[PDB]
Amino acid sequence: TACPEESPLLVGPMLIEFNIPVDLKLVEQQNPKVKLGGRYTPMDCISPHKVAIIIPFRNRQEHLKYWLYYLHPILQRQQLDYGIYVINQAGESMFNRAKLLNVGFKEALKDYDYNCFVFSDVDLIPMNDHNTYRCFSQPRHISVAMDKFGFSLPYVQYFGGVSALSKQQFLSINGFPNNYWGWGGEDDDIYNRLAFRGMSVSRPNAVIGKCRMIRHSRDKKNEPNPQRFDRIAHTKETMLSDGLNSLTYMVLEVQRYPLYTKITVDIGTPS
Amino acid sequence: TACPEESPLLVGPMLIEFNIPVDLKLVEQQNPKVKLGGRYTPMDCISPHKVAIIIPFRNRQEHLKYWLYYLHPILQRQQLDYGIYVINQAGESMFNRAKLLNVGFKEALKDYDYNCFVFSDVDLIPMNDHNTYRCFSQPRHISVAMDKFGFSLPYVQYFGGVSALSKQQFLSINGFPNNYWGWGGEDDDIYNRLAFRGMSVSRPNAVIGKCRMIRHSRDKKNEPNPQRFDRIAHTKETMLSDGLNSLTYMVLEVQRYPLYTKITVDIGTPS
């Protein structure tokens, strides 16, 4: 007992494809050590990383299937004491990614003394298990080089896709904004919060930080290079009042599926 | 003694590549006339250009190596009485480019009566030595046509990458902003400052002003045009109070390497 710096099981570069539809009954089968609700704890070593992976969700059951298929194996290989949480937005009104992420943080803590949080879109898979889904000395940007972006960071302050913050780092910035409702920029806002609290972004190199975007059918088109939203005055101004401390929502239901926990919640409408 | 208008040693178009790793011991060897700390003064003619080259720096030792390897010989070929300063951000908070540049200006003057300042990123190399690293009648934008931007200027008000200002011109604008803690637009702010102080931008032409960006391995893919942030009103507002006259920092260490001067500084956190 006492986990090693790096993990022995690391396979490094991996093959990621989406032409092979999958069955969750299968992933369950292939990932036996994974207890109810998507929980897994190393049975040999003692991991210092209690990670809760939060996934903003809404009508992406297919993406979720591929996501679970790839990540569960990877995560156990990284020797992580982790849990999976799918925060499902109940309405049919604007999607609110950031807010669902805040909800995950709060809900997950009701289950375990997690000290680390990975916020991941369902449609992203890491192509190299050296890209550890854990927290670092500074906030982590994991999805650094994405196939949909020519494997190139859109700009240095891009903090979208997959990231990780320790409980401390997360609290430090008052969580994430709840007021971006799918208008875009919340991830730029979150980056602003980090700078204001004197933190910076820790990243893996562009080689191991390569990631695939779940897009079956033959899609090779390179998604338009995203721009940065300039709302720096706005973050400094609203940061302390929009976030964890202003977070309100109703848990409509909680389902402990074999491979993950699914929390359906009502988070409101915008105004 | 008494230098000439255009240097005789000018080679013109040059070949710039980064597939051949370099050793600084070699650059020392190949640039013998370069005194401690990266200082060089023409031994024949008398140069009117006392130029301090300032480089914002942090964990880019490799780029520095290529930068030194190409620039040192180009500078001497331009017959500049110059010195190299790498300003190293000691923190682990958001990188503050412009602030480090201000520190360079102040620290370099403690060494020599420089009357000209070139501010350059480590990762840029000029592809034609007719693009003199000196000051002009108006502020100079040197890196005019960069390979990764398809050798075209991103926009007429782009003033990023490599530029030069006389002490007077720099002083005139109260140096550079110190408050842009990584969210960008600082170079747009600087351009604004110049407009406000009755100056305009001077540029070498597209051809002689071509530059390469240090990108080894094979990141041959064309880069996204740099984003222009609107800060006009903000600059009018804050220019006089944010800059040289508000500059605070602690010099943690000064190292006189053979090919350059390295000053590690603590420049604080954001607020």
Side-chain angles (χ1 to χ4, degrees):
Chain A
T1 50
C3 231
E5 182 75 316
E6 186 189 4
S7 178
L9 340 191
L10 273 27
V11 166
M14 309 169 281
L15 180 75
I16 311 294
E17 318 180 1
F18 314 110
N19 43 223
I20 42 99
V22 288
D23 190 295
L24 285 180
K25 302 294 176 192
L26 173 64
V27 184
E28 286 191 46
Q29 170 63 179
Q30 301 193 180
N31 295 281
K33 318 175 192 67
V34 175
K35 308 145 201 176
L36 239 195
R39 276 289 283 137
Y40 167 67
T41 313
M43 76 257 65
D44 345 47
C45 90
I46 294 300
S47 195
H49 312 294
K50 307 204 185 196
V51 192
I53 289 88
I54 314 310
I55 300 180
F57 182 85
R58 146 99 90 55
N59 198 205
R60 297 283 190 283
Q61 192 47 52
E62 266 313 296
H63 293 313
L64 215 220
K65 279 171 175 291
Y66 281 114
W67 192 93
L68 290 161
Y69 176 61
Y70 284 100
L71 277 289
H72 267 295
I74 297 186
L75 297 162
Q76 317 174 63
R77 288 212 292 272
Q78 303 186 332
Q79 319 186 87
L80 305 175
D81 181 350
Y82 71 93
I84 305 301
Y85 297 83
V86 173
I87 312 311
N88 176 47
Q89 179 173 329
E92 265 195 298
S93 58
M94 236 195 196
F95 192 71
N96 192 316
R97 186 189 162 249
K99 187 159 171 186
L100 290 158
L101 297 182
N102 279 339
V103 174
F105 174 77
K106 266 194 181 176
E107 292 304 300
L109 287 158
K110 296 190 176 186
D111 289 317
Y112 193 63
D113 50 316
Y114 294 124
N115 51 32
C116 174
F117 298 75
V118 175
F119 308 82
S120 163
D121 296 322
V122 256
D123 66 15
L124 296 192
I125 315 298
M127 307 180 343
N128 181 149
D129 63 12
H130 264 84
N131 194 2
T132 335
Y133 273 46
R134 56 162 255 260
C135 292
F136 294 58
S137 74
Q138 289 299 319
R140 255 265 164 159
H141 184 210
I142 293 164
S143 58
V144 174
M146 300 184 280
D147 68 45
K148 69 168 174 184
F149 285 149
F151 279 91
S152 65
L153 208 50
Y155 53 71
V156 251
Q157 25 252 191
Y158 183 78
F159 199 63
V162 182
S163 46
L165 280 69
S166 63
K167 189 180 183 176
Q168 232 26 59
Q169 300 178 332
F170 192 71
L171 268 4
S172 161
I173 56 156
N174 191 211
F176 304 139
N178 298 296
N179 299 152
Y180 285 79
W181 277 81
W183 267 300
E186 75 277 357
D187 63 316
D188 289 326
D189 185 285
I190 297 168
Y191 177 87
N192 292 340
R193 297 191 177 210
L194 296 185
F196 282 138
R197 277 292 166 294
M199 300 188 262
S200 65
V201 194
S202 174
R203 290 199 178 78
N205 67 215
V207 173
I208 85 179
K210 291 168 73 167
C211 294
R212 275 263 142 63
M213 203 218 82
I214 298 178
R215 52 189 186 176
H216 13 66
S217 295
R218 208 46 292 120
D219 311 317
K220 187 50 178 303
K221 306 268 59 55
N222 239 36
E223 269 191 351
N225 192 62
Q227 126 277 7
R228 200 196 154 186
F229 290 97
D230 185 33
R231 266 139 93 177
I232 318 181
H234 194 276
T235 305
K236 194 201 302 69
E237 190 73 35
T238 58
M239 180 181 356
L240 283 161
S241 61
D242 183 22
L244 258 180
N245 56 15
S246 66
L247 174 65
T248 67
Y249 66 96
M250 291 166 265
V251 175
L252 296 183
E253 170 180 35
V254 176
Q255 312 167 70
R256 306 296 187 156
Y257 286 109
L259 295 166
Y260 60 113
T261 297
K262 190 187 181 185
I263 310 167
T264 303
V265 301
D266 181 328
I267 61 149
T269 185
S271 66
Chain B
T1 55
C3 229
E5 269 272 14
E6 190 200 291
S7 185
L9 342 190
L10 266 31
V11 162
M14 310 165 279
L15 182 78
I16 314 296
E17 316 180 6
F18 318 97
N19 44 219
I20 43 88
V22 286
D23 188 297
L24 286 178
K25 303 294 178 191
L26 163 72
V27 193
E28 289 191 46
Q29 167 67 182
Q30 303 201 181
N31 295 284
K33 317 177 194 63
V34 180
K35 301 138 204 177
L36 232 198
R39 275 288 284 133
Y40 164 71
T41 313
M43 353 76 73
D44 349 46
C45 95
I46 291 301
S47 191
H49 311 303
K50 311 213 188 187
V51 190
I53 280 105
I54 319 287
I55 307 184
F57 179 94
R58 192 218 238 145
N59 196 206
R60 295 270 184 294
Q61 195 46 53
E62 267 313 297
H63 294 306
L64 217 215
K65 284 172 168 294
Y66 280 111
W67 192 87
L68 291 168
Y69 171 70
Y70 280 96
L71 273 303
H72 267 295
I74 296 181
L75 298 166
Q76 313 178 58
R77 287 219 295 285
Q78 293 176 341
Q79 318 182 99
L80 309 177
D81 175 1
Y82 73 84
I84 307 303
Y85 301 83
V86 172
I87 313 307
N88 180 45
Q89 192 166 328
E92 209 182 0
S93 289
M94 291 304 185
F95 184 76
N96 198 316
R97 184 191 167 245
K99 178 141 167 190
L100 293 161
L101 294 182
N102 279 343
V103 172
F105 172 86
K106 270 194 177 172
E107 294 300 306
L109 287 155
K110 297 188 180 189
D111 289 320
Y112 193 68
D113 51 303
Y114 292 123
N115 55 35
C116 178
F117 297 76
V118 176
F119 309 88
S120 171
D121 297 315
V122 256
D123 68 10
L124 296 191
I125 310 293
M127 295 176 348
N128 180 151
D129 63 12
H130 266 82
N131 194 18
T132 341
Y133 274 44
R134 58 158 257 243
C135 292
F136 294 61
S137 76
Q138 291 295 325
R140 250 243 172 163
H141 185 221
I142 291 164
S143 63
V144 170
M146 296 179 274
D147 66 352
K148 39 59 160 296
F149 291 161
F151 296 87
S152 59
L153 190 62
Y155 47 94
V156 195
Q157 12 262 185
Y158 181 68
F159 202 73
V162 172
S163 54
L165 284 71
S166 59
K167 190 181 179 185
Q168 232 29 57
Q169 288 156 352
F170 189 65
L171 256 14
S172 178
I173 53 154
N174 183 211
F176 297 150
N178 292 302
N179 295 146
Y180 291 67
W181 289 90
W183 36 64
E186 89 278 342
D187 58 309
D188 281 313
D189 182 284
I190 298 177
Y191 177 86
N192 284 336
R193 300 197 171 204
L194 306 175
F196 282 139
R197 295 284 171 272
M199 295 179 274
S200 50
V201 181
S202 182
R203 270 175 195 129
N205 68 190
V207 177
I208 100 94
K210 287 169 71 173
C211 278
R212 272 263 143 59
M213 186 210 87
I214 304 180
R215 42 189 197 168
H216 1 66
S217 279
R218 204 52 299 127
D219 318 310
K220 168 64 176 179
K221 214 290 109 182
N222 199 21
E223 239 148 282
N225 239 49
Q227 192 191 316
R228 189 187 177 194
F229 303 81
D230 162 73
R231 306 300 252 245
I232 302 183
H234 188 267
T235 297
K236 195 198 295 68
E237 210 68 338
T238 62
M239 183 180 4
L240 287 161
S241 47
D242 185 19
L244 259 177
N245 62 25
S246 80
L247 177 66
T248 75
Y249 64 90
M250 196 164 84
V251 172
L252 296 182
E253 165 178 37
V254 173
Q255 305 168 77
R256 303 295 181 162
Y257 287 111
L259 295 171
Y260 62 103
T261 298
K262 190 188 183 195
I263 315 171
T264 300
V265 298
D266 170 336
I267 58 159
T269 146
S271 59

